[PDB]
Amino acid sequence: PKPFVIGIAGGTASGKTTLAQALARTLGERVALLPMDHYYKDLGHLPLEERLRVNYDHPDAFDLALYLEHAQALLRGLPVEMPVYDFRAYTRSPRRTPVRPAPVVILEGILVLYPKELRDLMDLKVFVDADADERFIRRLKRDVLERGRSLEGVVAQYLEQVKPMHLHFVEPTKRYADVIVPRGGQNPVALEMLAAKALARLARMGAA
Amino acid sequence: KPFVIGIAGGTASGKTTLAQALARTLGERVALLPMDHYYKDLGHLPLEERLRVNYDHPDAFDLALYLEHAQALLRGLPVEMPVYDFRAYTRSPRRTPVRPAPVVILEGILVLYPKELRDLMDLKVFVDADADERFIRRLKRDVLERGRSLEGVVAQYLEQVKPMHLHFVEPTKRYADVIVPRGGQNPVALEMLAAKALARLAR
Numbered sequence: 001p002k003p004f005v006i007g008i009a010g011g012t013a014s015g016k017t018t019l020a021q022a023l024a025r026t027l028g029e030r031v032a033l034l035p036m037d038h039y040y041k042d043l044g045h046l047p048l049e050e051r052l053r054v055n056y057d058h059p060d061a062f063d064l065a066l067y068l069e070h071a072q073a074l075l076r077g078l079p080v081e082m083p084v085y086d087f088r089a090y091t092r093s094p095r096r097t098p099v100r101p102a103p104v105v106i107l108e109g110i111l112v113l114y115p116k117e118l119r120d121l122m123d124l125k126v127f128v129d130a131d132a133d134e135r136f137i138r139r140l141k142r143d144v145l146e147r148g149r150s151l152e153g154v155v156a157q158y159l160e161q162v163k164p165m166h167l168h169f170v171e172p173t174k175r176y177a178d179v180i181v182p183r184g185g186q187n188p189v190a191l192e193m194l195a196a197k198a199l200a201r202l203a204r205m206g207a208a
Numbered sequence: 209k210p211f212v213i214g215i216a217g218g219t220a221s222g223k224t225t226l227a228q229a230l231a232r233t234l235g236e237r238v239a240l241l242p243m244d245h246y247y248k249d250l251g252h253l254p255l256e257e258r259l260r261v262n263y264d265h266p267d268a269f270d271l272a273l274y275l276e277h278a279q280a281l282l283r284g285l286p287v288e289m290p291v292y293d294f295r296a297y298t299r300s301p302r303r304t305p306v307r308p309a310p311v312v313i314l315e316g317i318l319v320l321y322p323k324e325l326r327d328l329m330d331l332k333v334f335v336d337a338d339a340d341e342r343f344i345r346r347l348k349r350d351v352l353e354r355g356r357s358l359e360g361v362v363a364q365y366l367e368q369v370k371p372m373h374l375h376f377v378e379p380t381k382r383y384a385d386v387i388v389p390r391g392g393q394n395p396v397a398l399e400m401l402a403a404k405a406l407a408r409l410a411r
């Protein structure tokens with residue numbers, strides 16, 4: 001049948017990635033996860049200095065056409081070759097990774113609830129919430145330890161782009177969520193609840 | 209042991225209608241105890257004094273009786289629930305029976321405030337809605353159902369309801385496992401709470 005389509009959005013470092021991955025792990029082979037943060041437009045032909053200036057928190061930085069195409073293919077029972085973005089080099093990497101069709105599809109990303117075309121594919125819409133100061137702390141650690149950023153560059157990107165875009169584009173999408181999940185990285189009860197809903201949907205698919 | 213769900217939120221947040229809708233959905237599988245019917249019996253005080261009482265402070269509630277009844281429901285016993293009269297500012301001399309059930313719902317603005325109540329819950333829900341929208345619903349309900357004047361609602365809201373919401377209610381949101389918006393009309397959140405309750409029922 002139709003998969004269960006779950007959209008999970010939230011600000012940067014809100015716990016949304018960890019929650020989606022945990023749900024994916026709880027369901028095993030019955031889930032396909034498509035992270036929108038790997039779908040930035042391929043601007044690899046542009047010099048680094050130009051890629052450094054792009055605002056990666058504005059909707060137009062994303063290859064929405066491709067993301068939507070992949071989600072639609074998964075919905076038809078077809079596999080897709082998912083792009084992989086290189087946060088260190090600031091470009092779409094040459095690597096790709098296959099994603100197998102499954103009865104539950106999870107679309108996760110800071111802006112997955114922004115485009116009506118994406119929201120119209122979703123059966124369940126989740127927004128993962130956490131205060132900006134706590135998210136900034138996790139973002140700063142993530143950037144310095146995994147993405148080769150300096151503390152100074154993180155502060156500048158955050159104040160000049162991440163925060164303004166979060167207030168203008170990300171936070172208002174919270175109004176479209178069916179449920180809001182706090183403590184996304186460590187919330188066993190909320191995880192069990194999302195899992196129970198998906199399991200009821202899966203049981204519906206096999207029963208007749 | 210019955211599955212216990214606590215559902216808090218500000219006044220007119222939609223928590224009451226969400227709590228009642230879950231109950232309909234699960235039929236007799238649910239026993240519901242609204243904490244707003246548990247205000248302390250202050251019938252001995254003069255009317256004028258009762259009108260000035262702050263009904264949004266935790267100490268206005270008869271927590272001892274509420275806790276007592278929650279425990280009795282958990283041991284599989286029925287309880288005699290008090291009924292509060294919002295027009296008369298008084299606990300009714302008559303009570304109403306609540307039968308035990310495998311799912312118990314505790315709902316109220318301050319149900320997540322006492323640790324004693326929180327420790328009893330398997331799932332904690334906070335129903336969120338902005339204060340301006342809640343005030344709109346609170347003003348309408350008070351005038352049409354509780355004999356309040358518009359001026360009376362405004363004074364009670366600014367002098368007590370709002371300050372207590374900011375001081376006691378809103379901070380309890382940090383104890384919730386899930387936050388539910390548009391609690392008065394949220395089909396998906398309802399189906400999801402029901403799905404979790406049925407799973408715990410099967411065990």
Ligand SMILES: Nc1ccn([C@@H]2O[C@H](CO)[C@@H](O)[C@H]2O)c(=O)n1
Nearest residue numbers: 012037056057087090091110162
């Ligand atoms: N080249 C890039 C591309 C994206 N990002 C950050 O990734 C976050 C969304 O996952 C976004 O918040 C965005 O700031 C980044 O830091 N550098």
Ligand SMILES: Nc1ccn([C@@H]2O[C@H](CO)[C@@H](O)[C@H]2O)c(=O)n1
Nearest residue numbers: 219244247263264294297317369
């Ligand atoms: N005699 C009373 C007792 C309670 N209340 C209001 O009931 C709300 C909680 O349901 C609380 O917000 C409280 O203000 C009221 O208006 N008058």
